[PDB]
């Protein structure tokens, strides 16, 4: 029961679990009932963004890193061909939803500066 919070993905009520055992770590999400489960590494994330506390609909959003190796954004105009990754999760509490974002900020901030 270390590092976890009620996270609803794809309109599915489930609990999320962060694993900081490895460098890139791992964020597991299992349905509350028990049937659907998804796993996505947090290291892949690049930026963190969520809805304001005032917003009646409490939800978080995670943006992945862009591919600045093959993709090209022209020289003066930006001609990006692909698009960055962006996944959001529905929560039912500002405290829990805040515990996830606050943690994700440290996971990436520690792996983004360390390199």
């Amino acid at each position: 029961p270390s590092h976890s919070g009620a996270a609803i993905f794809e309109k599915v009520s489930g609990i999320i679990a962060i694993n900081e055992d490895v460098s890139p770590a791992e964020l597991t999400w299992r349905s509350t009932d028990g049937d659907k489960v998804h796993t996505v590494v947090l290291s892949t994330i690049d930026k963190l963004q969520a809805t304001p506390a005032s917003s009646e609909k409490m939800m978080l959003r995670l943006i992945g890193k862009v591919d600045e190796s093959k993709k090209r954004k022209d020289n003066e105009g930006n001609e990006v061909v692909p698009k960055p990754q962006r996944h959001m999760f529905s929560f039912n509490n500002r405290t829990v939803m805040d515990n996830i974002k606050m943690t994700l900020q440290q996971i990436i901030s520690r792996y983004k500066d360390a390199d």
Partner: peptide
């Protein structure tokens, strides 16, 4: 039509 709006709710604050 609430798909595009979904990006705004997360984009801005």
């Amino acid at each position: 039509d609430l798909d595009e709006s979904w990006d705004y709710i997360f984009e801005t604050t």
